[PDB]
Symmetry: D2
Subunit: 230 residues, 4 copies
């Protein structure tokens, strides 16, 4: 029963995605999670999500097996002139068929949750966030089990790698800016069996801010995923 | 680029589109055609099953064509005092394609004058005199149940068959091989296929099978494992 | 579990052990056998070439046996008014083994009473009356030039042949296939081989080829590309 | 010209061992010397390379490899000692011999060498003060470092990647036991520093002075390269 799935997209197409809320694929093959107006500028209170169109098996109830996975992606978050960024984007494992949740600081993921995410959090929410912008590991809550500071760079491609090792239960997320040569990493244990259903949708969720001048694009340029169910 | 790879040692309904009689058993076998509650195959059965996300086979903007490889183990079992019919096939079909004719048309083709935009590799257990060669055969099927090429296949009742199908977009060569690990026998067929001119840009990949329409011509059409990989140049 | 994988679209001497007449050309072809000053293959030529790191095929502590898959493109060219001889083989051999007999023994086996501890897949272009089947063939060779199993091979002069060899350690099935993309012809042979009982734990993987010993029986033995993968379960 | 390997246990048969390096009966790559009590010894120097060279770039085509390596290491310091000197993953010229002991990690003394060091001993002439992960381009004086909170005797998991399209080299380390993680990244022009073909592997040294010593054990190693 040793199952695997791997995919690699250097360009996106709608045909193998479930798009929700504001998410679209551009004619240039970019996954734009949040809404652009007719002038190509990001709008307020935007919420988009996008998932690979086939569910991934994360664990097996008969055998007690848990999947290991790795994903990499390139994102571009651009803030217009005279604006600050909000709210961020996340890679997520969510229940099959789940619909977007609350927007703004809850990143379309949160509002019995069964969601694990890695957030790239561009806006301080004083009720649960650390002060600086951060990479967070989110287990059924917007209040991360662990964060690491992230020195956000406006409009420059970020390259992410997230891995999950089912033998150590360690989830590790890293981001590098090839242009700035800066890099960030966070790691914590997450018991996927105890939090997620057996099958999940994998993909992304992103929101723009709810108030004028708190806004950003949330673009994915490339995405690779691989899972192995031991 | 748009690459995809999967490996199923056990099947689950969650990542398949099942059509007609196809089911996944509680043991994780993909049973393409109908079994009664005693595990005996029924007449005039038709099932298909596809991976639930479409595969990009070629790109009209760039002219790129995918290369792919698939392997699978199948088990065709014929009840005592029957011969086998009709066979099973691995296929690339248009997204949202519905099953076609039963019996000798393997749920992939019909007697219509419309092109199926379907490429398949058939494991054909029943002679249809209007298009088949006389012996049981592996065929390469391009928009027709009349294979562009076949090779004889010495069918073995109820024994696991291991298949490998490869498509090289640089030579346009499609190659299908089958081995019976129990009998140590092997078969192979090869032909060129221009995927761009026959398939749409995106396809569903999976299987189609039919049982015979007449008493004493019947078989199971079980898949035990399936691996697929595609790479769009 | 341990693995090794490599893929060469062009050869370089830096990652090969070359023996006898084997050379790598400035165009990146692995030429196993020699050319005379007239640009024709010479008589009694013998070359071998191995990946320069040994592969672990099995483990005596764990009882694990490797599964492997290899693919390669070869070009055998015969001068006008000649027939081909003797052939080329993919082989697993003991680490540090030296070339064996010329001609019909393909540089892999000799007339000694010692076990060569060698498994090969031969592409045999010359009938040897003491042990061969009548037609040219793909053979599976276990410690002897007298193949445990062969399949006829319709040799085509000077056309690229594409080979795939797989070994599944769970069924012990070794399968070899050849296709000519130009002719769309294909051949396959399969048999079980217990690698633990024949090979040492570590082997060198690569090729062996010979040209004929008598005028008018001669060929080139060129490798154009080679991919290998092993997985020690 | 692509190459991939994965060793969950080591064997001598596919390695070039230099100086003190050995493979144990348990299949661990021990880069530095152990005494009869299984304790690490002073002034040890060991290297170990995959026994086939890797093609890193091609002068005819201008192609540069992308690569990725992962490995688990165990650095153990005896009681009443501190650690020295560290271990490194390196790309070195084919047939390269070990260089200087101690703080030079067996790699330096233009040695046409690129390395990622896990540096357990402050050398005031070139190091930053805290233990660190460094990117080393032809010098023991890293082009870039990041602090590393060394944990005595706990398994460390490393990932190093090199993307030839961005020229970005990234190294990361995690302690699964402590849930701590570290990362450093810089651009490296491999064409201008390495030969076309290299040996890939490890170099490690134990300290030269009493009470500065460590084991330098590799437990698993995966490597993959792709010459575009
Ligand atoms: C392919 O993969 C699939 C999917 O993974 C495999 O299918 C699974 O197989 C396992 C093992 O056989 C099944 O486990 C068994 O489940 C039953 C309970 O079944 C009923 O409840 C299911 C759960 O419902 C809750 O959770 C879901 C989300 O996870 C939620 O949507 C529901 O609304 C519900 O929520 C409620 O409960 C929660 C806590 O439990 C609360 O928080 C929440 O707020 C609510 O109160 C449900 O999915 C299931 O429905 C499926 O199956 C029915 C048929 O029964 C079908 O009609 C439906 O369409 C669904 O498909 C049911 O309603 C449980 O009783 C079993 O327990 C026995 O075994 C355990 C294990 O040892 C023992 O501890 C027990 O004592 C007992 O003896 C068992 O756990 C699982 O139900 C099933 N899931 C699905 C989605 O089908 C499939 O087998 C794979 N195929 C192959 C070939 O391998
Ligand atoms: C990586 O993978 C590799 C390859 O698979 C593994 O390596 C292989 O490991 C196996 C298992 O250890 C080795 O084979 C064994 O080697 C044993 C030693 O072989 C040598 O020594 C033998 C004995 O030598 C003594 O006796 C002879 C007389 O018979 C004298 O001539 C000689 O001088 C010695 O005499 C002295 O000691 C004896 C002690 O018995 C006294 O009696 C005398 O008084 C005197 O003092 C010798 O016979 C033999 O020919 C060798 O020289 C051997 O015992 C055993 O049976 C077995 O063969 C492989 O050698 C090794 N292979 C390679 C390629 O190196 C490795 O394990 C793996 N590593 C991991 C981590 O898994
Ligand atoms: C993704 O692929 C789809 C399908 O090939 C493309 O959508 C088709 O585009 C053609 C060309 O304009 C239309 O005539 C079809 O009707 C489209 N089909 C659908 C379902 O709308 C699409 O262009 C590709 N997307 C990107 C971003 O490349
Ligand atoms: C195999 O690789 C070797 C080592 O790079 C190539 O030889 C070198 O080629 C470069 C560029 O052509 C020269 O700058 C070096 O001086 C060569 N060194 C030698 C010949 O030792 C060699 O050409 C490659 N072989 C093939 C068949 O491509
Ligand atoms: C380290 C995570 C495993 C990646 C393969 C699914
Ligand atoms: C994804 C594999 C390509 C097919 C040619 C052997
Ligand atoms: C190493 C992969 C080979 C498996 C044999 C089919
Ligand atoms: C399907 C390709 C086989 C050659 C080695 C991966
Ligand atoms: C061979 C894979 C390279 C990946 C480096 C980012
Ligand atoms: Ca926030
Ligand atoms: Ca028929
Ligand atoms: Ca012969
Ligand atoms: Ca130092
Ligand atoms: Mn946050
Ligand atoms: Mn037919
Ligand atoms: Mn022969
Ligand atoms: Mn240092």
């Amino acid at each position: 029963s040793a199952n695997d799935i791997s995919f690699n997209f250097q360009r996106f197409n709608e045909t193998n995605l479930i798009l929700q809320g504001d998410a679209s694929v551009s004619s240039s093959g970019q996954l734009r999670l949040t809404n652009l107006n007719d002038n190509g500028e990001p709008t307020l209170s935007s919420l988009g999500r996008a998932f690979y169109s086939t569910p991934i098996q994360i664990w097996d109830s008969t055998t007690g097996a848990v999947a290991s996975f790795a994903t990499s992606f390139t994102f571009n978050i651009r803030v217009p002139n005279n604006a600050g960024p909000a709210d961020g984007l996340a890679f997520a494992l969510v229940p099959v068929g789940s619909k977007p949740k609350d927007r703004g600081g809850l990143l379309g993921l949160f509002d019995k949750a069964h969601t694990v995410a890695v957030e790239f959090d561009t806006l301080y929410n004083r009720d649960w966030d650390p002060r600086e912008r951060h990479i967070g590991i989110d287990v059924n809550s917007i209040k991360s089990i662990k964060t690491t500071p992230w020195d956000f760079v406006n409009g420059e491609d970020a390259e992410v790698l997230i891995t999950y090792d089912s033998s150590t239960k360690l989830l590790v997320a890293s981001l590098v800016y090839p242009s700035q040569k800066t890099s960030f990493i966070v790691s914590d244990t997450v018991d996927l069996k105890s939090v997620l259903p057996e099958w999940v949708s994998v993909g992304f969720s992103a929101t723009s801010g709810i108030s004028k001048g708190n806004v950003e694009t949330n673009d994915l340029l490339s995405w690779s995923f691989a899972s192995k169910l031991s």
